[PDB]
């Protein structure tokens, strides 16, 4: 059925800022779902590829999801999403990987890039509905609410391959 | 008198090259692995000679892989190379001929007129180029041809349903070659989808191994062939390199004491590791031969592989006679159709909607891709199909004239403008 | 090579040497099938197949 | 909020099939595929579809009869569905003639030249062997890279097809439509592989079968 989502910790939720009140609105909107947030502030135009690779060479079996918030304004995630292939990330197996990206897909086992437009529009709505509806709809209604919200006020574009449901209860 | 015996191995000799030239000629492999040879229309004894220098070299390699080995498995090389060998072929046809077998190949049967229906595709004749030979399941048991196939699957195709089993000792086997896996699917199935499940199954963590293990993955299509020689140690002396890579007990416990039983505990050990095929050059034709019926024919392979005395006894009633009947209306089946005509009396209103398992009208059928004319004259001028009727579920509003057309089909498209409008 | 030549004795002539004679000695003198024996003949036909131009089949 | 797909009738289903393809082009046979088309009729036609199969179309055919059905009428209709079976390989459809972008298809579909067809659905089932056009109410499900190696014991259907025909004959009545897709993308990655679908989703709302 769904995702098995009651791991004894957490996945990490690294929010690499670029260049604001929406990074500090992320920022308490994950926090509240037990996650572990790690703020990176303005970096280069290469930045750092070892960031989230040193993220994928930890431990990750007691932590039941992974979050990688890319909020920039030239590095694609090809290079990025590499490291958490599930074969060379094998800690990081059969569970989440979201990529939620503002400004090429990488088809893989289980993974959701929530590609949106170039606080704004989308992390505004992000934002509130799981303050709200983080209770009974999984991932995927959050996410459908949310781009209704930006076109009827240029639309997000879910791409999924997620083999189960997710629910963040 | 007793002269007449070189005139007889001299022409064997002789019939086989061609068969050889053509793959040796043809073919992409050949050409990219610089194994080919200049294209010719009567070939000598250039083509014959060089398999056995292909040969030699897939045997010399494997060798070379390998030490000196040791007196433990010398129960096993010296075990399999001093055995009995029993091919089968396993066809749905016709080929007995009262007490004969005339099997014969592809390129032969398509010379002149036909009662094909195998299982060759575009690329097996552009790729390799090995349709003028006559393939054949390897059995390692050594019993008698006449107790029973134990092994009625090769990788994973049921090719027939009766088994023709032929001793190894025949004149006509010396010119053939042996390949350890399909020539074209260059991969052993593995485990799961092995057959003989209750083997393979009492012994784990090999499958995986077996389980899609290619053979020459240098072109990753490479695949090694050995001569009549060499075909005997090839077989053990690869199984030996598979089991050295290996870890298991059924390492040293059915391979090192079955040397003793070398029934279904050898037969079982090389059809699983390995999955032999004999390829015999253009015909096959012999008096000492066995025919197993190993399942009862259905009604569908009758009419693929036609077989009209078979067929015959398959019908019963008018029933039986629309569906053999819209199973000849595809394929274009010329012969079974024109049998059918003859024994019963259809009428229009049989040909009315397509039976359970068909997917086209009546009417797409017939100008269909691979259609045949003679079919579609007999129903127009019968009074069983409507030539300006258009289609009504697939492509519609169409008529049969479209589909000649489209496809480029003038010996049909001449077809319907005689026999109706359009 | 040369006793493969001279071996077809039942010739009479040089280049006439087989006409349908090899459909003779064939089955009659070993217990080849006529389905390949006939397959065996279709090769070398030339309405007389000469035996010295079927000696550059090597 | 939801579709409210209340109308006298659901709206179309398009069936594109190409199997033999002009040798020029160089492609394969593509056989067992008549089976899918005759599953995909069967199961859309179900619901309330009108389901028009279209075997062996050219470049240019698929391009103009769908500029006959985006102009024709959907005032009376709930959604619409397109399903391509091909032998595409890059993400574009390609024809018996010629290869085909997707984005010249979608283009006649957009809200502001199909009015007659906004706030609606317009899926899109593509089973190639990702230049997405993004417009709201869209969906598009491909699924590429076959292959598993089947020997000359020739593949019946195709695993996707298959699949997604399965899954929503029962399913397809109270349990949404992207929570379909989802048990697609899992029985083929499970009990299939021993490359996968992708659902680039663009709905506003959600889409319920009943
Ligand atoms: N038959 C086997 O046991 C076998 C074994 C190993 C591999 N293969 C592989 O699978 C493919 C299948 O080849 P195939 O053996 O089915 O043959 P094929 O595709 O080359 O065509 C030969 C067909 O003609 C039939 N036939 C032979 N003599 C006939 C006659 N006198 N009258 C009427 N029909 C006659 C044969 O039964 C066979 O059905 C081969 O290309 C080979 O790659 C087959």
Request: hydrophobic share 40%.
């Amino acid at each position: 059925n769904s995702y098995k989502m009651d791991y004894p910790e957490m996945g990490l939720c690294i929010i690499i800022n670029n260049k604001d009140v929406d990074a500090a609105n992320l920022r308490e909107t994950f926090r509240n779902l037990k996650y572990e947030v790690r703020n990176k502030n303005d970096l280069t135009r290469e930045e750092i590829v070892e960031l989230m690779r040193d993220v994928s060479k930890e431990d990750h079996s007691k932590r039941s999801s992974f979050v990688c918030v890319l909020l920039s304004h030239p590095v694609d995630l090809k290079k990025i999403t590499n490291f958490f292939r599930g074969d060379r990330c094998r800690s990081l197996t059969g569970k989440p990987k979201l990529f939620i990206i503002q400004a090429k897909i990488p088809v893989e086992a289980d993974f959701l890039y929530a590609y949106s437009t170039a606080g704004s529009w989308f992390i505004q709505s992000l934002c509130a509905m799981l303050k709200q509806y983080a209770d009974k709809l999984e991932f995927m209604h959050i996410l459908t609410r949310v781009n209704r919200k930006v076109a009827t006020e240029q639309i997000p574009c879910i791409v999924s391959m997620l083999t189960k449901e997710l629910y963040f209860y | 008198a007793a002269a007449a015996g070189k005139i007889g191995a001299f022409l064997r000799k002789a019939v086989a090259a061609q068969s050889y030239g053509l793959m040796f000629a043809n073919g992409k492999l050949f050409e990219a692995t610089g194994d080919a040879l200049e294209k010719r229309g009567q070939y000598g004894f250039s083509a014959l000679q060089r398999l056995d220098g292909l040969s030699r070299r897939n045997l010399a390699a494997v060798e070379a892989r390998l030490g000196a080995l040791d007196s433990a498995e010398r129960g096993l090389k010296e075990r399999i190379m001093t055995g009995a060998w029993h091919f089968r072929h396993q066809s749905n046809a016709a080929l007995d001929d009262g007490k004969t077998a005339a099997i014969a190949s592809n390129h032969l049967l398509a010379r002149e007129s036909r009662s094909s229906g195998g299982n060759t595709f575009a690329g097996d004749k552009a790729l390799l180029s090995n349709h003028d030979f006559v393939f054949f399941g390897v059995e390692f048991s050594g019993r008698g041809k006449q107790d029973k196939p134990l092994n009625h699957k090769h990788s994973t195709m049921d090719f027939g349903a009766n088994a023709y089993v032929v001793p190894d000792t025949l004149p006509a086997c010396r010119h053939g070659y042996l390949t350890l896996t399909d020539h074209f699917f260059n991969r052993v199935p593995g485990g799961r989808e092995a057959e003989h499940q209750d083997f393979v199954g009492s012994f784990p963590q090999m499958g995986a191994e077996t389980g899609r293990w290619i053979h020459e993955g240098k072109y990753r299509q490479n695949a090694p062939i050995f001569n009549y020689r060499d075909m005997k140690a090839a077989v053990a002396l690869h199984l030996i390199e598979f089991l050295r890579d290996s870890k298991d007990a059924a390492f040293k416990a059915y391979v090192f004491d079955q040397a003793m039983q070398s029934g279904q505990a050898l037969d079982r050990v090389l059809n699983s590791v390995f999955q032999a095929e004999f390829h015999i050059p253009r015909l096959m034709a012999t008096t000492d031969y066995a025919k197993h019926p190993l399942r009862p024919m259905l009604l569908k392979e009758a009419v693929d592989s036609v077989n009209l005395p078979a067929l015959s006894g398959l019908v019963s009633s008018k029933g039986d006679a629309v569906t053999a009947m819209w199973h000849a209306i595809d394929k274009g089946k010329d012969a079974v159709a024109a049998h059918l005509l003859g024994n019963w009396r259809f009428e229009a209103g049989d040909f009315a909607s397509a039976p359970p398992g068909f997917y086209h009208e009546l009417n797409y059928a017939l100008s269909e891709h691979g259609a045949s004319v003679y079919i579609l004259d007999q129903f127009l001028s019968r009074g069983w199909a409507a030539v300006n009727a258009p289609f009504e579920h697939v492509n519609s509003g169409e008529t049969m004239l479209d589909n000649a057309v489209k496809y480029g089909n003038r010996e049909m498209a001449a077809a319907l403008i005689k026999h109706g409008a359009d | 090579i040369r006793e493969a030549f001279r071996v077809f004795d039942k010739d009479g002539n040089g280049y006439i040497s087989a006409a349908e004679l090899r459909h003779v000695m064939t089955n009659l003198g070993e217990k080849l099938t006529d389905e390949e024996v006939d397959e065996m003949i279709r090769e070398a036909d030339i309405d007389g197949d000469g035996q010295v131009n079927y000696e550059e089949f090597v």
